[PDB]
Design a protein around this ligand. Structure first.
Ligand SMILES: CO[C@@H]1[C@@H](O)[C@H](O)O[C@H](CO)[C@H]1O
Ligand SMILES: [Ca+2]
Ligand SMILES: [Ca+2]
Ligand SMILES: [Ca+2]
Ligand SMILES: [Ca+2]
Ligand SMILES: [Ca+2]
Length: 182
């Protein structure tokens, strides 16, 4: 039985190897069990300095979500998160606008909808639009990492052609696709 909460299932992975791109972080995820798990209920993390994977920087980055950490990871030089679950979206057109250091990839129903496949200091990208064909809980996953230095991750979403954007949070997230009443 998987817990039902208004958020995505979060895993944190640290490493002392360099993370240069999405493939490197995905390989880290594949290589071992998560260094910590958490509930990602308010996906607006950071900004901070001096390496996400050091000290209590992960706690600071995750903020409101850090109280669900399964453990306090030890130090690493590099690290990132893998989030997976569901997001309620009505049928229609949407686009992400993501602020991040370093890179990331967001997929919905198996299709990438926001990608930065490299390291970068803090930068905001307005991504291309995508469509949702059927209203309901859509499958979503995210990866984000920090190679070192500063770190931030805020993937906002627009339903109105880029006029307004919202953070993905407990209003619309579900860990299993069932309706949360939490
Ligand atoms: C600490 O500053 C940032 C770092 O966070 C980013 O990963 O890579 C950038 C270039 O090294 C740095 O300027
Ligand atoms: Ca794993
Ligand atoms: Ca720590
Ligand atoms: Ca915060
Ligand atoms: Ca590094
Ligand atoms: Ca960084």
């Amino acid at each position: 039985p998987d817990s039902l909460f208004a958020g995505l299932v979060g895993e944190y992975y640290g490493t002392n190897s360099q993370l240069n791109n999405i493939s490197d972080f995905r390989a880290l995820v594949d290589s071992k069990e998560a260094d910590a798990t958490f509930e990602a209920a308010n996906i607006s993390y950071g900004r901070g300095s001096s390496d996400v994977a050091k000290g209590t920087h992960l706690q600071e980055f995750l903020g409101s979500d850090a109280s669900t950490l399964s453990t306090d990871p030890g130090d690493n030089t590099d690290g990132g998160i893998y989030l997976q679950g569901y997001v309620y979206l009505e049928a229609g057109t949407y686009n992400f606008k993501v602020t991040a250091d370093d890179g990331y990839e967001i997929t919905i129903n198996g299709n990438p909808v926001a990608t930065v496949d490299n390291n970068q200091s803090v930068y905001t990208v307005t991504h291309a639009s995508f469509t949702i064909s059927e209203s309901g809980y859509q499958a979503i996953d995210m990866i984000w990492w920090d190679q070192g230095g500063d770190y931030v991750f805020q993937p906002t979403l627009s339903a109105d052609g880029g006029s307004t954007y919202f953070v993905l949070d407990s209003a619309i997230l579900s860990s299993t696709g069932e309706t949360p009443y939490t």
